[PDB]
Amino acid sequence: HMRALAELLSDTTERQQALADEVGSEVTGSLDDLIVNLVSQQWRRPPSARNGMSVEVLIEMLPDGTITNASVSRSSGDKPFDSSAVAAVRNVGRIPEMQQLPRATFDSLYRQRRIIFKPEDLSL
């Protein structure tokens, strides 16, 4: 929910975004999306990626949001795809709002952050 796609209340184009992705009940504020926001700023699709190939990436971070680690937690079976996104994660290296949380909440959520890289609008 960033850049030009917030929600259904978003007059971007003809986008019937009635059923959006996961919401925040307990926690995971505007933060996961930030992480994600960041990751794509840093991320880079490969010629190998398909319109729904995906990587679970387990990150590790400091109470600053500074990414201390990041690996492929669950591979798409495409190391470029998987890793390009690792290099998406690692390149951000520090996320903003992690310092706005309870250390306990950060530990819960963003201590290790899991980013699922699952494309949109490929060539194929």
Partner: peptide, 13 residues
């Protein structure tokens, strides 16, 4: 936290 679906990356086409 719940793994968030990042579909975006470089501002490619």
């Amino acid at each position: 936290a719940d793994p968030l679906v990042i579909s975006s990356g470089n501002d490619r086409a």
